[PDB]
Amino acid sequence: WNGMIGEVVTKRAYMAVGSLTINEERSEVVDFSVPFIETGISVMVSRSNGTVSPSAFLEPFSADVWVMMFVMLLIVSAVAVFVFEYFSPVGYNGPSFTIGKAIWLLWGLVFNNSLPVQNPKGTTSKIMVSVWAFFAVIFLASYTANLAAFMIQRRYVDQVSGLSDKKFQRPNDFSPAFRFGTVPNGSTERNIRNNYLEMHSYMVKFNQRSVQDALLSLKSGKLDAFIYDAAVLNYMAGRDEGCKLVTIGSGKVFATTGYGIAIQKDSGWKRQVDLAILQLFGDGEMEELEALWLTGICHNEKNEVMSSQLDIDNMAGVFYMLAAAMALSLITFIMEHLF
Amino acid sequence: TIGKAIWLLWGLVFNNSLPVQNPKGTTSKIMVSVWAFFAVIFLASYTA
Amino acid sequence: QADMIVAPLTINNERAQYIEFSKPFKYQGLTILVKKEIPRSTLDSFMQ
Amino acid sequence: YVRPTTSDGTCREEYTINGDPIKKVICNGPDETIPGRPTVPQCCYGFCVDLLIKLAREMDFTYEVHLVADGKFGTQERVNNSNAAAWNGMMGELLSG
Amino acid sequence: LLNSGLGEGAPRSFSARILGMVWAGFAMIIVASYTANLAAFLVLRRPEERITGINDPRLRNPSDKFIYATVKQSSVDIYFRRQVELSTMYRHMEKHNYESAAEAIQAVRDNKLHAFIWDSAVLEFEASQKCDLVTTGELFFRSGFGIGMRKDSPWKQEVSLNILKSHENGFMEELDKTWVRYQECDSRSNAPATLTFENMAGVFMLVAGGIVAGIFLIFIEIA
Amino acid sequence: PFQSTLWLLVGLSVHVVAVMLYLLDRFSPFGRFEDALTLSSAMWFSWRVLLNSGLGEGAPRSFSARILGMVWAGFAMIIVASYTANLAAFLVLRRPEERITGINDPRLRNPSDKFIYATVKQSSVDIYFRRQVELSTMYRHMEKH
Ligand SMILES: N[C@@H](CCC(=O)O)C(=O)O
């Protein structure tokens, strides 16, 4: 072992501070005590795995507006056809001709006029067209207001319930490039090295140097993911110039640790020193120093992300449903041609 | 054609309302389609 | 009859002044939020 | 508000945007364009001027307004000026002469 | 007005043309105002009856009608005893408190108490289990929960190494992963389209009333 | 907010429906003249249901064009209602994406060389920053320049 910790072995440093996370190596070569602040290993970018946001058009339906619309179409078509469309005792093709035109008339009234088709003669049917048109404009107003109100809500990349995903085992999964790394010669290199051999062997080819180079790489577009300490990510992401990138979630990180001190031989104060830390929580200095030195710039409740519109992936899905209806109409055309 | 044209355009601006009729030339149908697109865009910007 | 406590107890100077304690495994704070209520109507027959 | 005297007479007479005559007083002040500090007779008018006119008409007395130049910080004797003593000549700023 | 379509002619007179133009404009005004009030109802202003953040100003001021009853005889009394800052509230919050946790958690949900002062440790479990409460975002007055042993016990270093190795391999991620169930609600205004069917049914019953009224109309017609 | 390839796909769907209306009913092969009949009429139907137009001469009798016109009108309502929702979301323009804080800006206590908080030199602000004792570490930074 070498570095600054050797100063504790050479009897040239009775006590030392800094970024010293408690773990087995520091507690193995020398002694330890209680950390004053907590931290851990975290990712600079959010937990999304490059997943595309889902569609927001079929979400308000939830397989309910189409089913209830079909049932209402059946009862409205039936009760609407057994009142004035069936006046004389006819055969089976009689009411069917009024049903085929009635469903197209109602469909024309739902989707905002579209096709006037025609109009009957009875005034009660005209009143029914007026009421159905009122339900059509009310359903349209509630559809545009509900869809817009749902669009104003949070629809950005949502966090997933998977920490160790495909990028922690096999590197050849994602076809587009996705670079990720950390600063060598540290606790993260030995922890990830002892926990994930593939991530280390695939990570040594992408190494950093400092923090400004990583910020320039993430700002330009050279680096994709960045994994480092939680405190450096809170101060780095906190002191941002545009408040674009954000950490994973809002404070839920793995591997809980903290920055502590290291002494040579347990013979002086030590214990009382720990009580000194216990005095800090008794004086409220953690809030003043936390809001004074540990603070940043982007501290305006980072919980919602909104911008412009992503890959019409939703309209592409609606187009896929239109292709499914096209195939259904093709099979229907085959069944019609077979007869 | 002006008296019916202004009423047709007024019908297209306020969302169909009355279909009235439609001529035969395809250029008038294309211009009516563009006027309907600008009409529903103006309606969307008006409601928003 | 007690040798070691597995309950997540707090760490203070009055308690740790006469006994040795280990490092905490989870740092959590105190909150004052109880519950929230969202006002809405279930029937919703407009004209309100 | 300090405004230079137009032509070679007294102040410029005007009105406000609500229908009320504005009063101006005579005030001698320097100029920032010329490197020197000459006695430039100008006309002052504003909130403190109207307040000075009100306090001047509510009490039977005469006054004379004058513009102050540079030196608006109490004059803190901190620059080493020859290794000698000093004396308070500002701070409050009211007793010059 | 109701936007209907037949197709049999058009008003040739200019008076009915201008009247129909201003009438269609009035229809667009009332439907655009109705839709605007619908969107204004969706969002809601609500942004009221919320909390403060790291320190609620209502805690420093004493209140008789809104008692902040907390857990009696616990770590909160030691925290309120070893402090010096909030000393004008320990006398008010010292009296009228419950010495049981289930009585307080059951009291704040069974309409009894106004509020409670307790850590989010049990709050996140009872809120993530009973689906009746919700936690906040900030965590003011942070504390640590450790294990205390005797000073003459040499096993504290071995157990400490077992805790460190237990947090280095990933066993804590399995415990917290299998003991923290992420259940549904996260904010008071995050999903405004989870109902819909009731809001549409409340008008559907009026549509059925219009169908019965239509049966009355055809009853007048056949008469 | 959306690339031109999306509208190109919308027009591509118009071509798919246009050739679909000709593929359904039987007619004759026609690359002989300039203007057709069922092709121009089918295009007038596609632009009639998509952009919501209205003529009055009849109605499609076949059920295939009925279902295709129903799902096509539904797609039109989806794109115009979704586009309206994108317009309202564009006019929401909610994003103060900026601010000072309130009674005490945390950026004032933290020193910064790229955003200098210059003030009036030699005035009452120097006396206020001199008689204080709280924010004393910033008097050296704000004292110069
Ligand atoms: N504290 C670490 C550096 C920060 C990190 O863990 O990334 C070390 O001294 O090696």
Q: Cβ distance A40 to A253 under 8 Å?
A: yes
Mark yes or no for CB contact E144/C14 under 8 Å: no
- Tally D–F CB contacts below 8 A: 7
Closest CA relative to residue A248, chosen from A24, A42, A34, A8: A42
Residue E127: its H or E element: helix E120-130
Q: Rounded to whole angstroms, how far apart are CA atoms F108 and F115?
A: 10
Residues 82-111 of F with CB under 8 A from B: 83-84, 87-88, 90-91
Distance from the alpha carbon of residue B23 to the mean position of ligand 1, in angstroms? 78
Closest approach atom of ligand 1 to CA A228: 7
Mark yes or no for CB contact F88/B48 under 8 Å: yes
Q: Rounded to whole angstroms, how far apart are CA atoms E103 and E97?
A: 10
Distance from the alpha carbon of residue A267 to the mean position of ligand 1, in angstroms? 28
Q: Rounded to whole angstroms, how far apart are CA atoms E168 and E164?
A: 6
Sign of CA dihedral E104, E106, E111, E112: negative
Shortest Cα distance from A208 to chain C (angstroms)?
30
Q: Rounded to whole angstroms, how far apart are CA atoms A80 and A75?
A: 8
Backbone angles phi, psi at A255, to 5 degrees: 55, 75
Mark yes or no for CB contact C30/E198 under 8 Å: no
Burial profile F57-67: b = 16 or more Cβ within 10 angstroms, e = fewer:
eebbeeebbbb
Q: Which residues of B touch F91 (CB under 8 A)?
A: 48
Amino acid identity of residue E130, one-letter, is K
Q: Experimental method for this entry?
A: cryo-EM
Work out the end-to-end distance of chain C between its first and last CA atoms, rounded to an integer number of angstroms: 67
Q: Rounded to whole angstroms, how far apart are CA atoms B19 and E8?
A: 9
Q: Which residues of D touch F123 (CB under 8 A)?
A: 72-73
Q: Is the CB of A48 under 6 A from ligand 1?
A: no
Q: Which residues of F touch B10 (CB under 8 A)?
A: none
Q: Rounded to whole angstroms, how far apart are CA atoms A253 and A246?
A: 13
Give the three-class secondary structure for E50: coil
Q: Is the CB of A186 under 6 A from ligand 1?
A: yes
Q: E54 touching F, CB under 8 A?
A: no
Mark yes or no for CB contact D72/F127 under 8 Å: no
Pick from B16, B19, B48: CB nearest A112: B16
Distance from the alpha carbon of residue A195 to the mean position of ligand 1, in angstroms? 16
Distance from the alpha carbon of residue A42 to the mean position of ligand 1, in angstroms? 12
Shortest Cα distance from F90 to chain B (angstroms)?
9
- The conformational region for residue F122 under phi > 0 = left, psi -120 to 50 = alpha, else beta, is left
Mark yes or no for CB contact C27/A38 under 8 Å: yes
- Spell out the residues 6+ positions from residue D52 whose beta carbon is closer than 8 angstroms to its own: D25, D63, D65
Question: Which residue minimizes the CA distance to atom 1 of ligand 1?
Answer: A19
- Spell out the residues 6+ positions from residue A210 whose beta carbon is closer than 8 angstroms to its own: A183
Shortest Cα distance from E112 to chain A (angstroms)?
32
Closest CA relative to residue F127, chosen from D72, A238, A16: D72
Mark yes or no for CB contact A113/B15 under 8 Å: yes
Q: Cβ distance A24 to A195 under 8 Å?
A: no
Shortest Cα distance from F101 to chain B (angstroms)?
31
Distance from the alpha carbon of residue E169 to the mean position of ligand 1, in angstroms? 18
Evaluate whether chains D and C are touching (3 or more beta carbon pairs less than 8 Å apart). no
Burial profile A233-255: b = 16 or more Cβ within 10 angstroms, e = fewer:
bbebbbeeeebebbbbeeeebbb
- The conformational region for residue B25 under phi > 0 = left, psi -120 to 50 = alpha, else beta, is beta
Backbone angles phi, psi at A263, to 5 degrees: -115, 170
In this complex, which chains have at least 3 CB pairs below 8 Å with chain D?
A: F
Size of chain C, expressed as the number of residues it contains = 48
A310: exposed, middle or buried (Cβ count in 10 Å: 0-12, 13-18, 19+) = middle
Sheet of A254-259, strand order? A180-181, A225-229, A37-43, A254-259
Closest CA relative to residue A50, chosen from A176, A151, A172, A207: A176
Which tokens is E140 given?
A: 């003011």
Give the three-class secondary structure for A180: strand
Q: Rounded to whole angstroms, how far apart are CA atoms A294 and A239?
A: 10
Work out the end-to-end distance of chain F between its first and last CA atoms, rounded to an integer number of angstroms: 44
| Crossing angle for the helix pair B26-47 and F63-92, to the nearest 10 degrees | 40
